[PDB]
């Protein structure tokens, strides 16, 4: 007759949630500003636009 | 002087007007000369050979920045003088770009392309397209795609259809225009 009888479900839920958090911490790109040009920009200056931003 | 780097014979051969007596030599010269600067002003490139410059400079930003006005040259030191300098200082530009770093501050350099074999084919193709549009398309009627004449029961779509842009002329030169930043 011990408390560990009735805490399996929540401790497992906690482990799963914390594993999800740890994983998503590294793996979701931390970048913003998804910039996009069009197929008419002479890459040779699209390098220059990037260096501008 | 536009006689050696755009022979009227090449124009008369491009626009296929070598048998038109209604385009005299003076008229074609006026077209060729109003289109060698209406689409040079547009690109901001002189066409003469390497042509020195001298101009004032104003530093911008707390970390120092010198915006020039020519994209000077590849590998030749631009030098600064005056403006509290004790000796003319020489910087080296980076190719294509026109930004440098460290009683008005002056600067001198040499812009232009080395040889007299002047403006590349890109520039010329633009002029040829612009001339052709100019000689057989005066501005008197609004057109539509495939030189058709429509109606629209509302405003003509002829917003334009009457400007260099139409010919791939204007857009050719752009290939050499540099999207600032």
Summarize the structure.
The structure is cut from a larger assembly and holds chains A (53 residues) and B (181 residues). By secondary structure, chain A is mostly helical. Chain A is built from 2 helices and no strands.
Number of strands of chain B: 6
Radius of gyration of chain A: 24 Å
Number of DSSP helical runs of chain A: 2
- The H-and-E topology of chain B, N to C, reads as HHEEEEEEHH
Residue share in helix of chain B: 10-25%
Protein name (chain A): Portal protein
Organism (chain A): Agrobacterium phage Milano
Protein name (chain B): Head-to-tail connector complex protein
Q: In words, what does this structure look like?
A:
The structure is cut from a larger assembly and holds chains A (53 residues) and B (181 residues). Chain A has 53 residues and is mainly α. Chain A is 47% helix and 0% strand. Chain A contains 2 helices and no strands. Chain A has helices spanning 8-25, 46-52. The longest helix of chain A has 18 residues, at 8-25. In chain B, 16% of the residues are buried. Chain B is elongated, with a radius of gyration of 22 Å. Chain B is an alpha+beta fold. Chain B is built from 4 helices and 6 strands. Chain B has helices at residues 8-14, 25-34, 121-135, 168-174, and strands spanning 51-56, 66-67, 78-81, 89-91, 99-100, 106-111. In chain B, strand 3 (78-81) and strand 4 form a beta hairpin. Chain B has a 4-stranded antiparallel beta sheet, with no helix packed on it. Chain B has a two-stranded antiparallel ribbon with strand order 2-5. At the A-B interface, helix 2 of A face loops of B.
Write the layout of secondary structure elements.
The structure is cut from a larger assembly and holds chains A (53 residues) and B (181 residues).
Chain A: H1 8-25, H2 46-52
Chain B: H1 8-14, H2 25-34, E1 51-56, E2 66-67, E3 78-81, E4 89-91, E5 99-100, E6 106-111, H3 121-135, H4 168-174
Antiparallel strand pairs in B: 1-6, 2-5, 3-4, 3-6
Helix pairs in contact in B: 3-4
């Amino acid at each position: 007759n011990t408390p560990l009888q009735a805490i399996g479900v929540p401790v497992a839920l906690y482990d799963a949630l914390m594993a999800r958090a740890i994983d998503s911490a590294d793996g979701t790109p931390n970048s913003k500003w998804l910039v996009t040009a069009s197929r008419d920009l002479d890459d040779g200056q699209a390098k220059e636009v990037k260096e501008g931003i | 002087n536009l006689d050696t780097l755009l022979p009227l014979q090449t124009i008369r051969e491009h626009a296929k007007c070598d048998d038109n007596p209604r385009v005299t030599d003076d008229l074609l010269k006026l077209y060729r000369e109003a289109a060698f600067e209406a689409a040079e002003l547009y690109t901001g490139l002189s066409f003469t050979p390497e042509k020195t410059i001298v101009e004032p400079i104003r530093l911008k930003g707390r970390r120092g920045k010198i915006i020039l006005s020519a994209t000077p040259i590849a590998g030749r030191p631009v030098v600064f003088y005056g403006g509290g300098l004790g000796s003319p200082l020489e910087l080296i530009p980076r190719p294509g770009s026109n930004v440098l770093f460290f009683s008005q501050l002056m600067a001198t350099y040499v812009t232009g392309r080395r040889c007299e074999n002047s403006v590349p084919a890109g520039i010329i193709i633009g002029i040829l397209k612009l001339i052709a549009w100019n000689i057989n398309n005066p501005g008197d009627e609004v057109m539509s795609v495939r030189n058709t004449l429509n109606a629209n029961a509302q405003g003509l779509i002829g917003g334009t259809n009457n400007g260099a842009v139409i010919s791939g002329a204007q857009d050719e030169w752009f290939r050499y225009r540099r999207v600032l930043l």
